[PDB]
Each structure stands twice: as C-alpha cells, then as structure tokens.
Amino acid sequence: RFLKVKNWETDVVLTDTLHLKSTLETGCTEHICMGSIMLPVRTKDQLFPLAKEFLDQYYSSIKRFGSKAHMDRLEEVNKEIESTSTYQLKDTELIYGAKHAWRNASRCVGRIQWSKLQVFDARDCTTAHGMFNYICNHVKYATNKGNLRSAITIFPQRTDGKHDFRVWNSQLIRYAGYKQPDGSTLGDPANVQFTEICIQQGWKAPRGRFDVLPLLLQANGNDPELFQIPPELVLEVPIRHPKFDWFKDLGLKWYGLPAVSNMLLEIGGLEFSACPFSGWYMGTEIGVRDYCDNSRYNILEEVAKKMDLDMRKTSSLWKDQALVEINIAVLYSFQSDKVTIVDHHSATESFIKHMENEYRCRGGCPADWVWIVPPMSGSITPVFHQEMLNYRLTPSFEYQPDPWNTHVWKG
Amino acid sequence: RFLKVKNWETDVVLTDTLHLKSTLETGCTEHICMGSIMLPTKDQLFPLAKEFLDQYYSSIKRFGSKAHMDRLEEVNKEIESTSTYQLKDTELIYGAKHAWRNASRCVGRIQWSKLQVFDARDCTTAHGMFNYICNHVKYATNKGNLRSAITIFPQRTDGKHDFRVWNSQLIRYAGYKQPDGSTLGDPANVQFTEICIQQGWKAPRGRFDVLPLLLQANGNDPELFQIPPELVLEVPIRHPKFDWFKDLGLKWYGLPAVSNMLLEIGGLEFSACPFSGWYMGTEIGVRDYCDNSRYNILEEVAKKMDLDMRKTSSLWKDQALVEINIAVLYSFQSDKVTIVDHHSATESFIKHMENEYRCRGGCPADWVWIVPPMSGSITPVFHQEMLNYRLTPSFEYQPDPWNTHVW
Ligand code: HEM
Ligand code: HEM
Ligand SMILES: CNCc1cccc(-c2cc(F)cc(CCc3cc(C)cc(N)n3)c2)c1
Ligand SMILES: CNCc1cccc(-c2cc(F)cc(CCc3cc(C)cc(N)n3)c2)c1
Ligand SMILES: C[C@H](O)[C@H](O)[C@H]1CNc2nc(N)[nH]c(=O)c2N1
Ligand SMILES: C[C@H](O)[C@H](O)[C@H]1CNc2nc(N)[nH]c(=O)c2N1
Ligand SMILES: [Zn+2]
C-alpha cells in the first residue's frame, strides 16, 4: 500500500511507503483520533525477534544484508539471548541505533541533523559518581563554548528492571522552583516537585529565581545521589532586547544547552533507561513556552506593562505583541553571545527539506504535526501547511514514568 | 474505553463517553495517525433514520413514547414506499443545530443552539435559490450585528437533481492571473473566477471584487447572480496606530458564509446548505492576508514598518503579523461588525468543552484545526487534549460541482 501527503501551500505531494515497516501502535483507532493526547521486565520470548529486526535494519544500512557477518551476528545474538537472556550491542550498532532513534522521533523538528550525533558509550559505568563524570564530559563536549554539538550518552541497559540506571532530572540543566507559603512560586513552576526531592535529599537551595538544579543520579538501581554540575560548565545567556533597554532589568537568563535526560532509548528490544541527549534550542522553546506559558515563568504581563500596551481588552493583542518582543530578545541574546540557537522560521524550513529528502531516500518521514508546528506564528511557517503521517518506528525514544514514582528505596 | 482528556495548563481532567456513540471513521488506524490530513440504497437508509430519530426523541425526553414509536413506524413506512423520507420541521432544525454541535473542527460551537434555520426545501429554481440566499445574507448580516444562520435547500434524490451552490463561500473576492505573471485579487479563487467569466460574468478585474453567485437548482446548469452590494457588508482595514495602513487598500467582508459543504441528517443528504456565523480575527489577518498562497501582504507591511527583513531571526514576519491582526480586529470593532479575537474564541471553546463534557459526555474536537494559526500556546486550547471522532448529523465535504456536473 501507498499513502500520499500534500503540502497545501506548494501542492507538492509525497508518497509514504515507510509506514508499512511500522509495528508499534499509535493510540488511534478507526473511530477515534488521539493525535493531541500528550502521552497515549521483558523476556527472552519477545526479544530475539526484536533483535533480529534491528540487525536486519543495521546490516541493510551498511549494504551487508545476508552476508556472513550478518548471519554470524544473528547467530551470536541468538545464543547470547538464550544463554544469558539478553545481549550486548556492538559499538557500531549502538551508534546506529541512537542515530535512528533520533531520526525516528516524530515529534522532533530538528531531525535534519540526525546523522551528526556524537554517541558517548557509558555502558561500563557502575556508580553514580561515574555517571556524574560521564554527564560532565557530555555537557562540556556538547556546549563547546557556545558552538553547540549534538550528543547522547548511553548508560547500561535495563536487566531485570531492579537495577536501572536513571537520571532523575528531566533535563540535565534546569532551574529550581519553590512553592512559597503565600501560594506563589519562585523560579520555574515546572520543577517544584523535583526541587523538593533534591532539597529532601540534602540539596542546599539558594532559593533564587534561576538556580541550576543539582544532578540526581541513580546507578544500578541504588538510591540516587546528588551532584552539582561545575558552574563553569553551565553556559547561560542574560536576556536583553535589541531596542528595549528596560528588558535586561527584568533579570531574565536561560541556559544554552537543552539536554533531555528522562527518556528511554529502545534499540533492538534493549532498553536504555538513562540516555541523556542534547542539541541546541529553537528560540520559541524558551521565548514562548519557558517564559510565557501561564504555568511557567509567565512574564507576559510584566513585559506588556513595561511596553505600555492596552492590557484591558484582549483584542488589543497585547499578549501577542509582548510574545514577539520576548522571542526577539531570546534570539538576539543567544546570537550576540555566540550561543547556537535557531529561530522557528529557519527550523521549520529545514524540517520540510529534511522531510522531502526522507520521503525520497527512505520512503517516508513520521511526523507529529501537533508538535512540529511551532507554538507561535504557526501558519506563517511552512510546516503548518504540510500534511504529515505519524507512526512509530524503532529504534525509538520513549517516555517512562518518573523514577520517584517507581523506585524502591534502600535507605 | 471510557477516555480521559487532560488540560496541561490547569490539570482539569474530563472523561469522554460520547465517542462510543460515534459511527463513521476517522482515517486513523492503530498503526498510523492521519490527524493532519486535510481530507481523509433503501437498506442503508432506515438504520440511519432510526439512529437519528432515536436521538431526537431522547433529546425531547420522549424516548420510548407513543409519538416516538409512531414516527419511527411512519418514517419506516415512508422509506419502504418512497425509498426516502422527509424531516419534520422540528427534526430539521434539530439536525442542523447538531451538525454544527458535532463539527469537530469548529472553534465557535459555544453558539451551536442559537442557529437560525431557514427551510428552503420548497425551492425549485436558481432564481428562487438566489432569493433565499439574499434573505439569508440580509438576516445574518443584520447591519453588522451578525447572527448565525443556515438555509437548507432540497435534499438529494437520485444525484442527477442536486441543489448546489458553486461558490465555496457566499461572499468571496475574485482572483485573476495577470499577463505580467502574478495574481490579482484572491489566488484561491482564480479557478472559480475563471468559471464565472467562462460562463458569462463581466469582471471589474480589481483586487477585491465580490464574486457573483453561481447557483444550481435541480441539477440544471448553474446561473449567475450578483448579490446586491447593499447586502454585502465590507470593512475597510485601518490600523489604530499606523496611518499608512489605510493606503495599503485592504478591506474584507463581514459575513463568513460557507456554501459548499453537505449536511447529513438521518441519512438524508442536503447538498446545498449555506451557513454563516461571524469571523474569528485570525481567519482574515493570519490566513487570508498572510498565507503565501493568498493575499500574502507580509512583505509590504514589514516594508512600511521598516523592519529588518534581512534575517528571519529578526521575527519581522511575526511582528507584522501581529499588527495586521490588531488592525483587522480594530477595523471591525470600529465599524460595529461582529468579530471575535482568537483569545476570546478559544476561551469560549474551553468553556464549551466543559459544558459538553458535563451535559453530553464529551465534545469531538480537532486540535489541528482548533488551535489558532498564530500565538498557539498562549491560547488555552493549545494545552487542551482533545479527542476527535465523527458524530452525525454532520457537515461533510463534497466534490466541487464542475468536476461532476453532467453539463
Ligand atoms: C539539534 C537540534 C534540535 C532541535 C532544534 C530540536 C527541536 C525539538 C523541539 C522544539 C522539540 C519539541 C519538544 C518540546 O516542545 O518540548 C523536540 C522534540 C524531540 N526531540 Fe529534538 N531537537 C534537536 C535535537 C535532538 C536530539 C539530538 C535528539 C535525540 C538524540 C532529539 C530528540 C527529540 C525527541 C525524542 C523529541 C520528542 C519530545 C517528546 O516527545 O517530549 N532532538 N525537538
Ligand atoms: C458563529 C461564529 C463561528 C465562528 C467564530 C466559527 C469559527 C470557525 C473557524 C475559525 C473554523 C476553522 C475553519 C478555517 O480555518 O477555515 C471553523 C470551521 C468550521 N465551522 Fe465554525 N464558526 C462559526 C459558526 C459556524 C456555524 C454557524 C456553522 C454551521 C452551522 C459552523 C460550522 C463549521 C464547520 C463544519 C467547520 C469545519 C469545516 C472544515 O472542515 O473546513 N461554524 N469555524
Ligand atoms: C511536555 N513535555 C514533557 C516531556 C517529558 C520528557 C521529555 C520531554 C522532551 C523530550 C525531548 F526529546 C525534547 C524536549 C524539548 C527540549 C529539547 C531537547 C533537545 C535535545 C533539543 C531541543 N531543541 N529541545 C522535551 C518532554
Ligand atoms: C482549507 N479550507 C478548505 C475548505 C473547503 C471547504 C469549506 C471550508 C470551510 C468550512 C467551514 F465550515 C468554515 C470555513 C471557515 C469560514 C468560516 C465559516 C463560518 C460559518 C464561520 C467562520 N468564522 N468562518 C471554511 C474550507
Ligand atoms: C494538548 C497538546 O497535545 C499539548 O499541549 C502539546 C501540543 N503541542 C506541543 N508541541 C510541542 N513542541 N511541545 C509541547 O509541549 C506541546 N504540547
Ligand atoms: C496540513 C494541515 O492539516 C492544514 O494546513 C490545516 C492545518 N490546520 C488548519 N486549521 C484551520 N483552522 N484551518 C485550516 O485551513 C487548517 N489547515
Ligand atoms: Zn489519529
């Protein structure tokens, strides 16, 4: 079967065959679409077919499908599974798997970059201190003094689910949030729960509005341990506006390195529960979501007051006016400090080229419109007008429950 | 199977049971989501009629009543006999209001029960259709105090006698391809502007020429009619800050009146059912004015604003986009023509959703269409999980008539 998608701005039509290789389920049925739903201990039984399919993919990509190297690897993995109940990926396979998990990430607009991913193998790590060392090296490498480089660090895979490696931080670099007795929040409201865990674990909170959270690292299923990222490794950008001199006095900054650390990396049926990865920011992630979500720093009103817009009627679009200026400031500040950032116009245009290229060389590109379209100025970006097909391919990044909800404490 | 939708800004969780009553298919499967795809006999009829009559009599709290069973029998008699049936006026009004209520792509559904339904099922000619449409337009426009309305022409019989309005909207601006190479007026209507000229129309070849109506009654060739200009309420677009905005020469019409959809009630098909409400500001300012395939004024506006258009990262497009949409709202509000901004309309829809979940068990909703085309995440609908499913009565798409008309 074949499936067509149309760009309604350009009339370019693309044909998807790649969805045929999709096995995992979407959440939708013939009778309900769950496309806007945020989120809709594995035995040898199901593992060898997952390994075989991955190794077929791997050896096909290197033009060795059916070779003796391919057949020998299949044999070797089979015997390792039935004898040890799991198996170890070769370095080349791990790198391939991590790159393709990114390539397959249908919610990621930044995938044109997928093949230039730096993969750090941390599968020999055994302790939380070792994890901290690997993560520091990741941050330093990825940050590269502002010339950001994509990277992923891969800690040992799950064994029986009782010895998991986990990074308890949702991102490697994030600001604390503190609930005050008067009901207000200081810092990032998204991080109040995690901040409280850190404090309970012994973290001495500075209780400011932009406190970089400590790392909370769990090795081999043991209780997690606290570590402070060396401050010289945390590149931050003070936010100023190119026309509004009062904007700096808002006291805003952000960190340069977006580094997601709570997802699970699935490769050939193996589960890597700690696999922090990093790229560089699209400006709206900070300017629209981090700063202007009502549930986050929520600076629209203070910015709009300082711009002296008509704030009495929403049809003045004072929120839309302030939002644009804030996002101009974020982009101006990062570029002025020579920290890598991409605006949503450039990013979505690159994604369309990537997607067309993927349809030609690969037969498709799974894409989640709900997430790909940026959270401001949607229809003046080319992705808004692009039909997209969403389906799940493996290798993949998956969500996993927050570890404090599942962890068995040792004491 | 009893599904939950979460609002991630407010943590409000609603439980949807209405989707289990859904019948038609979404285009999605368990292996592939098509949420962003724009367009995915005697025996079939009686279950359709039964399903509809059942919900009608339930809604008036007469389920399982004498009148319910009688009407079920009478329609059953009529289908066995005539191979179709006719709706009572009460059922027709109910069916049209619920077609709107069920329109999962419509953000303006909080108004669904205040729809004025005009029964035009006695219409037989295109001149009669024109007359009904003029009355609709005058009633709906209401000197700028817009009122929702639908006019329902006779239902399909054998598909040879269809009533169709060939316009996609009752009021739209013409589109002309220049010898110079580009497009004058609305590029989206270049083909329809051709079919009007290629049928008799005499075009002013301006930038904002109201298109004539092309009306097809009973399957005959469609006929041209000019809507009386005094019935077409237009708003000149000015900005409450930039005096040069007026010189751009922009205007738009006040009445959004979709005329090319098909209304399905109880299995009966109404191929000509123009309906109208009032605009959300972004439909004009974001889509009509700033789409690259439409009037595409962003460059000229940014030029007049003297923004740095060298690099995309100056967000000059975004800045211009905001000012254009401030002016649209300002112009309509100043001329006392009903319009709603995207902030108000999406707040209304969240309120509508909670109402529908409370009193009905759910609300089918298409996030890809509901979230406005600018400033998405500062509107509450962006953070609202939505379930999309197809209920009937419904409005459906249908092929353009010129691709079907046995001429
Ligand atoms: C290189 C520059 C990159 C850019 C500009 C970028 C951009 C984005 C953005 C804006 C999102 C939306 C998520 C949100 O709004 O919270 C996203 C999602 C995602 N990205 Fe990328 N990304 C980049 C690199 C990467 C890398 C290196 C990886 C993995 C190796 C990755 C994997 C993903 C995944 C798995 C998601 C799904 C998010 C989720 O489901 O919550 N991205 N990306
Ligand atoms: C009264 C104020 C109304 C507002 C503010 C409103 C708003 C909207 C908007 C913004 C859209 C998106 C369509 C697009 O972007 O092209 C839409 C779609 C739609 N509206 Fe409403 N509308 C209103 C009244 C009505 C009425 C009276 C009906 C029918 C009786 C209706 C039926 C629909 C349908 C069927 C769609 C989706 C059609 C499609 O798939 O393109 N609307 N509406
Ligand atoms: C509602 N989000 C909850 C949630 C939970 C767990 C993970 C994520 C998440 C996952 C991602 F891969 C990406 C994001 C955006 C942050 C981000 C990451 C990267 C690598 C580049 C970029 N430019 N930006 C967020 C989000
Ligand atoms: C990409 N659209 C293609 C297409 C084709 C056929 C019909 C439509 C369409 C259908 C609708 F019910 C509504 C619209 C927006 C116009 C509109 C209509 C009404 C009643 C109120 C409003 N405020 N606005 C457009 C759209
Ligand atoms: C309800 C909805 O699915 C949710 O708000 C999504 C919408 N699209 C998004 N898109 C991106 N990139 N990031 C997000 O967090 C979200 N949130
Ligand atoms: C491809 C995509 O489905 C298409 O551009 C849609 C996106 N969402 C939309 N939403 C609304 N309200 N109106 C539209 O025309 C569209 N177009
Ligand atoms: Zn779907």
From Swiss-Prot, chain B:
Binding-site residues, (6R)-L-erythro-5,6,7,8-tetrahydrobiopterin: S36, V368, W369, F382
Tissue specificity remark: Isoform N-NOS-1 is expressed in brain and colorectum. Found in the Auerbach's plexus of the enteric nervous system. Isoform PNNOS is expressed in the penis, urethra, prostate, and skeletal muscle, and coexists with the cerebellar nnos in the pelvic plexus, bladder and liver, and is detectable in the cerebellum.
Effect of Y279S: 30% decrease of nitric-oxide synthase activity
Record: residues binding L-arginine: Q169, W278, Y279, E283
Modifications made to the protein after synthesis: Ubiquitinated; mediated by STUB1/CHIP in the presence of Hsp70 and Hsp40 (in vitro).
Location(s), subcellular: Cell membrane, Sarcolemma; Cell projection, Dendritic spine
Binding, heme b: C106, Y397
Domain statement: The PDZ domain participates in protein-protein interaction, and is responsible for targeting nNos to synaptic membranes. Mediates interaction with VAC14.
Function, as annotated: Produces nitric oxide (NO) which is a messenger molecule with diverse functions throughout the body. In the brain and peripheral nervous system, NO displays many properties of a neurotransmitter. Inhibitory transmitter for non-adrenergic and non-cholinergic nerves in the colorectum. Probably has nitrosylase activity and mediates cysteine S-nitrosylation of cytoplasmic target proteins such SRR. Inhibitory transmitter for non-adrenergic and non-cholinergic nerves in the colorectum.
Similarity comment text for this entry: Belongs to the NOS family.
Subunit composition and interactions: Homodimer. Interacts with DLG4 (via N-terminal tandem pair of PDZ domains); the interaction possibly being prevented by the association between NOS1 and CAPON. Forms a ternary complex with CAPON and RASD1. Forms a ternary complex with CAPON and SYN1. Interacts with ZDHHC23. Interacts with NOSIP; which may impair its synaptic location. Interacts with HTR4. Interacts with SLC6A4. Interacts with VAC14.
UniProt protein name: Nitric oxide synthase 1
UniProt organism field: Rattus norvegicus
